[PDB]
Amino acid sequence: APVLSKDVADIESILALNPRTQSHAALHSTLAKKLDKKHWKRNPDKNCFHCEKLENNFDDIKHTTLGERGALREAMRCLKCADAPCQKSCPTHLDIKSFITSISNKNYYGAAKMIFSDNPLGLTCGMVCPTSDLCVGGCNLYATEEGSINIGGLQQFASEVFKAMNIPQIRNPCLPSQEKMPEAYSAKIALLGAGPASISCASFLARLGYSDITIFEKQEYVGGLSTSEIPQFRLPYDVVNFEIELMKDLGVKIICGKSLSENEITLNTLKEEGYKAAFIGIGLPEPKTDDIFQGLTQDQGFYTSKDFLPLVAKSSKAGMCACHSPLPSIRGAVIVLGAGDTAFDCATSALRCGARRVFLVFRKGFVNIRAVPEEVELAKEEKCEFLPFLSPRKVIVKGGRIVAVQFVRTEQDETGKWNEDEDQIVHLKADVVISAFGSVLRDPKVKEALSPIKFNRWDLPEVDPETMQTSEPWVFAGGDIVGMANTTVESVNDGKQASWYIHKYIQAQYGASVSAKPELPLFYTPVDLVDISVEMAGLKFINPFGLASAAPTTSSSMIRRAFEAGWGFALTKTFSLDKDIVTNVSPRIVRGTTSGPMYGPGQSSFLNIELISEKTAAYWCQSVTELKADFPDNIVIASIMCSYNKNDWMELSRKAEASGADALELNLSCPHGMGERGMGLACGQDPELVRNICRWVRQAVQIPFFAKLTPNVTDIVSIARAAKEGGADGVTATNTVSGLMGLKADGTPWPAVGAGKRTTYGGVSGTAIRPIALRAVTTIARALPGFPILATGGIDSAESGLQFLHSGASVLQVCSAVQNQDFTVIQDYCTGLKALLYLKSIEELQGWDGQSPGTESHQKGKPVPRIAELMGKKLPNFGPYLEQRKKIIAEEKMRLKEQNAAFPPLERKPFIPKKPIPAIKDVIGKALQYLGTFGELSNIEQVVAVIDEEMCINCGKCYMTCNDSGYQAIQFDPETHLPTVTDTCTGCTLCLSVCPIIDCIRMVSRTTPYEPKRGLP
């Protein structure tokens, strides 16, 4: 019979590309290499000077866009810094540390809530903020080779998920009922212009309780420049609509077709009409012009950015207008004049209109470009040509058309000044000219409508930079109109700033005072109303999260701050009688090596050789009395430990109870009387000793007490049962896992103590032991139904916490997650749990896994075009294949231009719960139904792996894993590097487990014949 230990021809063939170490250096000529290189090319080719067709292509071109896989990686990378410089560098002071922490914990709702609390246009800003000159410019990670965090992309991601949840914004909960609001809040308020500034101002005023807010917008569309000029390929119109609807949820009214102008709305007519306050947020409505372009028409080929961008927007943004607008026909060479964002967006937009070539002409040098590198990069990658040091002089017009523009040289002298060299000219051929010099306010009728407010030397409304108030106390202004900044986030901040002082002004007008300290409300939704309280062992917890007896509870002052932060409960560090006083050694707590040489945030574990508290029982008991007196609703559990002695346990437990502790937690780590039978060395490892100790405490106190169990036992259920039989009211599962974190190359340990560099076995904590704790909790919950369990072991998010609740635990203890961060994580845990419970009531989101939307086919986090001429073509994203994909996509865009259609918009409508929102008590133990013996698992219902070609990044890991750890069932194409799972798959699932792309590989029910490989008959 055949050589069993040898691969047959077929398998040898399938293993052709499997890694094998070479015994010699490789020989490939330089010429051969030059040729082969093209086949695998991923990035832009430096030698290719021809741009990829972009006519009618408005697909997202942002390099910062992130999908869930990418967002989680970047969020975990963030150091989540104290007094973070990125936040200091953000105009709206977003708590970046907190929102990124939430994203890293998969709590997208909490992240979005944090974002929108300080920036009502959070999604728009995540997408368009020039971060390199703002938040990212101050990021501490810039000091590392890998670089600064993609803050904008993370903000965009969390906000997009929230948008997908279709949850509405709600009125401030702690606010009195609409009917009980003081009359001052009904004051008629008017805002002019529906752009970022007014949207923000109106939003914050509405949060404060004002019920009569109206925004008067000149145009038929809303959103300001975010709608009329920023390209669809950078800022999708549906984003703007989303943020507007959120504002409308607060009652803000918007009336379009109304202009602030002398023969229409004026400050005088508003005051006559009874308006108490007004906010001017009309931006800079007119284009900066140059005398040389006077008289030129669009038919001749001349446009100002104010003419051009809105035309492209109306045509590419579904919804914006009621009438379908044609895409401007831009053919030939295009000259764009300007060096700011306007110019770059005109250049890129011109390509979508069919431009053959685009020239960006600056009057200064490259170094003087105004737009941030990120913006410049977009025009650069699309092959726009940059021409520096040129100033326009004349537009040659022949046959009623622009045929060229004549320029003159410019240069900086010996002081810095700029001059024009007349004898040095340039005759640049062009068919279209677009001036993108900027914008201004110059309509006399508009300025007159603002009488009698004072205008500064820049001929713009003068305002106090702190209050945003004009010379007229009831009139405020912000955004581009003030002329201080030119970004969406700064305009949003102006409205935010103004809202507080408008509030102060109105209240004063009604004879009411306001807090000296500004107090703008946060952002709220129905999720915030979800009840996450839970009752266990007769105790009421405001929320299920608490601090475990550990380093974070080293001092009672820390517990105090934890309760102030919002933690539901806390354990004191374990303490004992005076005679059992201990002294710690140092070093004693080290990082885990459980996930490789990854330093900084998110350590996968810690190992400690710390003893019980070094502080006295007297200190802890007085501390408990103090804590319970000041925080009656927060549960305080005293952790205590004694040697195996009845009088001692009774004495200490009674002392703790007398201090006012809500309950006790018995630390069973103390060694016994003389080893002997293999029940370890600690009392907690022997059922008999545990039972006795619990009996002693039960007899001594009347308050509930829980036995903290060690996972270092053969059968933890035996110990849990012993504690129950002893009288314990529940058990804490579990303590740390015994281990050695590692040795240095010289053999010395870490931690290493004293001159002798000695160590002893320590306790492992963190996410690395979560599988062990989860097993412990579930096994105890199944063996002792209804017996209270306090879970501990790797809990670092609402999601992981919910896993333990589902496993049978009632409350959740945390240590390592706090050591990795700080007490503020409680805010993430609470909003996260509320969101998870809330989402369970939304029928239309059942396909989601918690807060994670179903994974859709993507590449780099961008939706893969579902084009018939692409699905099933085996065209990977590299080399000649990518060229083909681009050609196909370009053809589709042209077809879409032909086959016209565009008005099936989405009347945004919030999802409404269709079943009661589950309370904590309703989810406890729900996972137990799926757990059982191996025999209870079906060996008939087998699965096989299936790969989504469109999501694949061609690494071949699935292939390598099946080859050297599986069944050699995957074919890896030598040309496309695309994997195909064959019929020999056994569904072991290893490939799916090593794939870098989330959900690229999925396990599906086997449809073909199934037979175990016995290797022989």
897 binding partner (options a copy of itself, ligand SF4, none; Cβ < 5 to 8 Å by kind)? none
Q: Is the peptide bond before 176 cis (omega within 30 degrees of 0)?
A: no
Q: Toward ligand SF4, which CB reaches closer, 874 or 921?
A: 874
Residue with the two structure tokens 């004349």:
394
Amino acid residing at 994: V
409 binds a copy of itself (CB under 8 A): yes
Q: Toward ligand SF4, which CB reaches closer, 85 or 483?
A: 85
Binder among 243, 262, 345, 494 for a copy of itself (CB under 8 A): 494
1001 binding partner (options a copy of itself, ligand SF4, none; Cβ < 5 to 8 Å by kind)? ligand SF4
Q: Is 310 annotated to bind ligand?
A: no
The strand pair at 439-440 and 286-287 is best described as antiparallel
Q: Is 480 annotated to bind ligand?
A: yes
Contacts (CB under 8 A) with a copy of itself, residues 744-783: 744-749, 751-761, 764, 767-768, 770-772, 774-775, 778-779
9 binding partner (options ligand SF4, a copy of itself, none; Cβ < 5 to 8 Å by kind)? none
- DSSP code for 380: H
Could you tell me the smallest distance in angstroms from the CB atom of residue 75 to a copy of itself?
Answer: 9
Q: Is 479 annotated to bind ligand?
A: yes
Residue with the two structure tokens 């259609």:
901
Q: Is 86 left (phi over 0), alpha (psi -120 to 50) or beta?
A: alpha
Distance CA 447, CA 439 (A): 15
- Give kind and range of the element (H or E) at residue 617: helix 617-630
Binder among 183, 291, 423, 898 for a copy of itself (CB under 8 A): 423
- Give kind and range of the element (H or E) at residue 406: strand 401-412
Q: How many Å is the Cα radius of gyration of the chain?
A: 34
Amino acid residing at 828: D
5 binds a copy of itself (CB under 8 A): yes
Q: With contact defined as beta carbons under 8 Å apart, do 793 and 770 qualify?
A: yes
**CA torsion sign, 667 to 673 to 675 to 678?**
negative
Distance CA 690, CA 387 (A): 82
* Cα 572 to Cα 559, 707, 819, distances in angstroms: 8, 14, 16
> Which parts of this chain interact with ligand SF4 (CB under 6 A)?
947, 952-958, 979, 995-997, 1000-1001
**Residue 252 buriedness (CB in 10 A; 0-12 / 13-18 / 19+):** buried
The gap between the terminal CA atoms of the chain, to the nearest Å, is 11
Q: Toward ligand SF4, which CB reaches closer, 144 or 268?
A: 144
Contacts (CB under 8 A) with a copy of itself, residues 498-557: 500, 518-522, 550-552, 554-557
Could you tell me the smallest distance in angstroms from the CB atom of residue 124 to a copy of itself?
Answer: 17
Q: Is 488 annotated to bind ligand?
A: yes
9 binds a copy of itself (CB under 8 A): no
- Give kind and range of the element (H or E) at residue 569: strand 569-571
Distance CA 629, CA 640 (A): 21
Q: Toward a copy of itself, which CB reaches closer, 162 or 959?
A: 959
- DSSP code for 595: T
Region binding a copy of itself by CB under 8 A among candidate stretches 53-61, 228-236, 280-288, 560-568 = 560-568
Binder among 27, 516, 868, 906 for a copy of itself (CB under 8 A): 27
Question: What contacts 200, CB < 8 A, 6 or more positions away?
Answer: 119, 120, 121, 491, 492, 493, 494, 495, 496, 499
Q: Toward a copy of itself, which CB reaches closer, 668 or 927?
A: 927
383 binds a copy of itself (CB under 8 A): yes
Selecting among 201, 670, 683, 830, the annotated active-site residue is: 670
Q: Is 225 annotated to bind ligand?
A: yes
Q: With contact defined as beta carbons under 8 Å apart, do 204 and 519 qualify?
A: no
Q: Is 218 annotated to bind ligand?
A: yes
- Give kind and range of the element (H or E) at residue 589: strand 589-591
Three-class secondary structure of residue 554 per DSSP: coil
Could you tell me the smallest distance in angstroms from the CB atom of residue 913 to a copy of itself?
Answer: 16
43 binding partner (options a copy of itself, ligand SF4, none; Cβ < 5 to 8 Å by kind)? a copy of itself
Contacts (CB under 8 A) with a copy of itself, residues 109-138: 117-118, 132-134, 136-138
Number of residues that bind a copy of itself (CB under 8 A): 295
Q: Is 683 annotated to bind ligand?
A: no
Q: Toward a copy of itself, which CB reaches closer, 259 or 556?
A: 556
658 binds a copy of itself (CB under 8 A): no
637 binds a copy of itself (CB under 8 A): no
The full DSSP string for 281-305 is -----EE---GGGTT--TTTTEEEH
742 binds a copy of itself (CB under 8 A): yes
Angle at 24 between CA 22 and CA 30, to 5 degrees: 100
- Residue 822, both tokens: 């700080």
Q: Is 221 annotated to bind ligand?
A: yes
868 binding partner (options a copy of itself, ligand SF4, none; Cβ < 5 to 8 Å by kind)? none
Could you tell me the smallest distance in angstroms from the CB atom of residue 356 to a copy of itself?
Answer: 11
Q: Is 195 annotated to bind ligand?
A: yes
The strand pair at 1001-1005 and 943-947 is best described as antiparallel
Q: Toward ligand SF4, which CB reaches closer, 190 or 960?
A: 960
Q: Is 995 annotated to bind ligand?
A: yes
Residue with the two structure tokens 């300001």:
224
Distance CA 496, CA 475 (A): 15
23 binds a copy of itself (CB under 8 A): yes
Could you tell me the smallest distance in angstroms from the CB atom of residue 979 to ligand SF4?
Answer: 5
Q: How far is CA 407 from the centre of its chain?
A: 48
Q: Toward ligand SF4, which CB reaches closer, 152 or 979?
A: 979
Q: How far is CA 308 from the centre of its chain?
A: 35
36 binding partner (options a copy of itself, ligand SF4, none; Cβ < 5 to 8 Å by kind)? a copy of itself
743 binds a copy of itself (CB under 8 A): yes
Contacts (CB under 8 A) with a copy of itself, residues 199-258: 204
Could you tell me the smallest distance in angstroms from the CB atom of residue 32 to a copy of itself?
Answer: 8
Q: Is the peptide bond before 587 cis (omega within 30 degrees of 0)?
A: yes
Q: With contact defined as beta carbons under 8 Å apart, do 484 and 465 qualify?
A: yes
56 binds a copy of itself (CB under 8 A): no
Region binding a copy of itself by CB under 8 A among candidate stretches 504-512, 531-539, 662-670, 740-748 = 740-748
Contacts (CB under 8 A) with a copy of itself, residues 782-811: 794, 799-800, 802-803, 806-807
Q: Toward a copy of itself, which CB reaches closer, 548 or 728?
A: 548
Contacts (CB under 8 A) with a copy of itself, residues 967-986: 967, 972, 974, 977, 986
Q: How far is CA 593 from the centre of its chain?
A: 27
Question: What contacts 996, CB < 8 A, 6 or more positions away?
Answer: 69, 953, 955, 957
Question: What contacts 421, CB < 8 A, 6 or more positions away?
Answer: 408, 409, 410, 411
169 binds a copy of itself (CB under 8 A): no
Whether 670 sits among the annotated catalytic residues: the reply is: yes
Q: Is 481 annotated to bind ligand?
A: yes
**In sequence order, what are the beta bridge partners of 814?**
547
157 binding partner (options a copy of itself, ligand SF4, none; Cβ < 5 to 8 Å by kind)? none
Q: Is 555 annotated to bind ligand?
A: no
Could you tell me the smallest distance in angstroms from the CB atom of residue 1000 to ligand SF4?
Answer: 5
- Residue 570, both tokens: 């806390």
**Residue 82 buriedness (CB in 10 A; 0-12 / 13-18 / 19+):** exposed
- DSSP code for 265: B
61 binds a copy of itself (CB under 8 A): no
Q: Is 568 annotated to bind ligand?
A: no
Distance CA 112, CA 163 (A): 9
**Residues with a known catalytic role:** 670
Residues annotated as binding site?
78, 81, 86, 90, 128-129, 135, 139, 155, 193-197, 217-225, 234, 260, 339-342, 363-364, 370, 436-438, 479-488, 549, 573-574, 608, 667-669, 708, 735-736, 766, 792-794, 815-816, 952, 955, 958, 962, 985, 988, 991, 995
Residues annotated as binding site for FMN?
549, 573-574, 708, 766, 792-794, 815-816
Residues annotated as binding site for NADP(+)?
339-342, 363-364, 370, 436-438, 480-486
